[PDB]
Structure 1
Amino acid sequence: ERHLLLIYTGGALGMQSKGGVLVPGPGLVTLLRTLPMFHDKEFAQAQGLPDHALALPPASHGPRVLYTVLECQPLLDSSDMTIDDWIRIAKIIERHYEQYQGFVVIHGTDTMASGASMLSFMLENLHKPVILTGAQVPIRVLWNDARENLLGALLVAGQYIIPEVCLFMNSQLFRGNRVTKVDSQKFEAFCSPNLSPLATVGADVTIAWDLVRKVKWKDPLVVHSNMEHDVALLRLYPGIPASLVRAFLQPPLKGVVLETFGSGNGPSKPDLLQELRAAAQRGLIMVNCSQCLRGSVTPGYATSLAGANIVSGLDMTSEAALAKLSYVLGLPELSLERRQELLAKDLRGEMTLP
């Protein structure tokens, strides 16, 4: 047997209709008990399990999967989630780390990529799978993506040692800090533009073991609650004025992800560059990420944004860059130089170095 903790934070997967809109819905364990694909009643009685503990039916062989449902309160639409919600989830995982062999987190899709990226950084030396999942359509609606997304997440966590924060949706397992949301309606909502999926499910399960990170059994789990909250993301647009950039970069901001054009470029107008220089003088750290879905930030143009206190984000998603910025700025007693060096490293599999 392998035992999982299923953390239900909210999201459409569990929502219910109220006043003509979808809102978070409690009572997950109650529903899942009634579904044979999610709970094997015979086995529960035959083994006299507790009532909190659900049991998946068996595959041919491999261990049997048991799981406990922890329903957070209040449950959230993921558009309301922030760094503090992700820290709380990491702390749940830390508190129960020794009792379970893996974790599944049900989450709204709206900020799932940010949550996966944040958790990836918060869970240092992670040894066990932490699989986020969600749905475009609630599990209570007959035709939905929720059933198979949740089951897949549980079976991945229950059966494979993938020591990473991942996202499981639509038969694919992505590295959490590589994903971004690309479709607001289709079941294929997420893409990992600069990395293959870690796994695919079909007639068989194919895992990219060449990509999956190695378990560091020697090192203990270190959960970083020290994540810098004063970080932001700023998307450049043509003609963005220096005065607006000045206002945006005022204290107490400590870091910003600049989402630039193409291969990492912005306007070369001197008043704008002067505001970036001024911010650097104040100690602000800036990461240059491309607005483009695919590819990498590279130098080469006179408009390339590089310079004092600007670190290239290379091929990172903006979600990963913001999480990494929060993580690195939250580390105690480092110099600015050192913080910039850490930003330029691949710390969790989020960035490919050239």
Structure 2
Amino acid sequence: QKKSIYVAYTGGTIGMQRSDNGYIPVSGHLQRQLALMPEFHRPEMPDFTIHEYAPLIDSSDMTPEDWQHIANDIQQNYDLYDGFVILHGTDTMAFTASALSFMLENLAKPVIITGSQIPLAELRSDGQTNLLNALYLAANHPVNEVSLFFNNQLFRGNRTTKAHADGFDTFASPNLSVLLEAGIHIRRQSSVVSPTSNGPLIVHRITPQPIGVVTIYPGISGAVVRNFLLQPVKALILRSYGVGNAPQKAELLDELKNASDRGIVVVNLTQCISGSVNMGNALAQAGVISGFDMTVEAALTKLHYLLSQSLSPNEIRQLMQQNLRGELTDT
């Protein structure tokens, strides 16, 4: 009972009720259910307080305004609690985790994002396991980062991506070990070091930004790429081949160079599931910068973070390449 954890129920199946025509949201259901589940109220578990969002947020409909609402909620409650669990739908859980990691600078209490495939109230649901363990971990094994908890593993949030969804749900962090394994015996993986706090919590403002995220393929044309870079685009994430290669084709390279010449930030990520971009090539000559081993989620949210501040394109290009929150490995 000693530790006290804030639970923000933003949306997601985890808190829903079953019906003849699908799982459905029901106000107050999550709290009503938990009151009747004594395992949540054992002496070994922290006290917790639930704030249900109204309306609930469908994670596929999430916008950066919703990222900001969650960051604000953590910030106004920061001193009152020892840690924070955010319940969230699975579809964009990894985007929210990544965004929060950039927004919550100098975070010094644990923030765990989680959810489930099956509502808490069903028999055998992952909802019950995920909430129970996020609460227990936040209180007893705090990791002072934005992390994501799923299938018994605690991932660094800005290293996660959704790995599967059809018939069952699963997350992965392809380029970094988990922070912690939550089986029968909880095991922190201490070779993954958390970002250090250089002062008081600073909560940044993020707004929607016009970013293109596109995939290179054989014969992709200048005209097509030209359209990707039209106003109002401020930045473009390229997903290229292998260690960051693209066609040596003037048509393509001229469009990217003209874009960078007018202030557009162009970031190279790999199409590969894991591994790093390693870039002099013609792409560098065209102003394109390396996204290293970032996930699409981390790159996309990091661009939102940097474009939302008062930074020149050159300042942005430099910071995109620096490890700000543990989201990238640079040699």
Do the two structures share a fold, i.e. TM-score over 0.5? yes
Query: Between the two proteins, what is the percent identity of the paired residues?
Result: 46
- Which residue number in structure 2 is paired with residue 201 of structure 1? 182
2:5/2:83 contact within 8 Å kept: yes
- Which residue number in structure 1 is paired with residue 114 of structure 2? 133
Q: 2:85 aligns with which of 88, 104, 110?
A: 104
- Which residue number in structure 2 is paired with residue 12 of structure 1? 13
Counterpart AA for 1:337: N
Q: Tell me, what secondary structure is at the counterpart of 2:164?
A: coil
Q: 2:132 aligns with which of 142, 151, 156?
A: 151
Counterpart AA for 1:30: R
Q: 1:314 aligns with which of 288, 292, 296?
A: 292
Q: Tell me, what secondary structure is at the counterpart of 1:232?
A: strand
Greater CA drift, 241-250 or 304-313:
304-313
Counterpart AA for 1:29: Q
- Which residue number in structure 2 is paired with residue 36 of structure 1? 38
Normalised by the size of structure 1, how large is the TM-score? Answer: 0.87
Q: Tell me, what secondary structure is at the counterpart of 1:190?
A: strand
Offset of residue 202 of structure 1: 2.2
- Which residue number in structure 2 is paired with residue 184 of structure 1? 165
- Which residue number in structure 2 is paired with residue 339 of structure 1? 316
Q: 1:82 aligns with which of 53, 63, 68?
A: 63
Shift in CA distance, 85/170, structure 1 to aligned 2, threshold 3 Å: same
Distance in 2 separating the partners of 1:95 and 1:166? 20
Distance in 1 separating the partners of 2:210 and 2:19? 35
Counterpart AA for 1:336: P
2:12/2:88 contact within 8 Å kept: yes
Offset of residue 244 of structure 1: 2.1
- Which residue number in structure 1 is paired with residue 141 of structure 2? 160
Counterpart AA for 2:171: F
Counterpart AA for 2:300: L
Aligned pairs, how many? Answer: 329
- Which residue number in structure 2 is paired with residue 49 of structure 1? none
- Which residue number in structure 2 is paired with residue 292 of structure 1? 272
Greater CA drift, 278-287 or 122-131:
278-287
1:220-299 aligned at under 5 Å gives the runs: 220-227=200-207, 229-299=209-279
Distance in 2 separating the partners of 1:119 and 1:232? 21
Unaligned runs of 5+ in 1: 41-56
Distance in 2 separating the partners of 1:20 and 1:307? 55
1:228/1:329 contact within 8 Å kept: no
- Which residue number in structure 2 is paired with residue 47 of structure 1? none
Offset of residue 230 of structure 1: 2.1
2:115/2:127 contact within 8 Å kept: yes
Distance in 1 separating the partners of 2:142 and 2:195? 9
| Root mean square deviation, CA, Å | 1.9
Q: 2:305 aligns with which of 321, 327, 333?
A: 327
1:280/1:308 contact within 8 Å kept: yes
Q: Give a deviation string over 1:63-94, Cα, whole Å, max 9, x none.
A: x5111000001112211111111111000011
1:162/1:212 contact within 8 Å kept: no
Distance in 2 separating the partners of 1:220 and 1:184? 38
Counterpart AA for 1:58: P
Counterpart AA for 1:292: C
1:56-95 aligned at under 5 Å gives the runs: 57-59=42-44, 64-95=45-76
Shift in CA distance, 23/77, structure 1 to aligned 2, threshold 3 Å: farther
Distance in 2 separating the partners of 1:204 and 1:251? 53
Q: Tell me, what secondary structure is at the counterpart of 1:182?
A: strand
Distance in 2 separating the partners of 1:102 and 1:276? 44
Q: Give a deviation string over 1:143-193, Cα, whole Å, max 9, x none.
A: 321110111111111112311000011111000000111111465601111
Shift in CA distance, 20/186, structure 1 to aligned 2, threshold 3 Å: closer
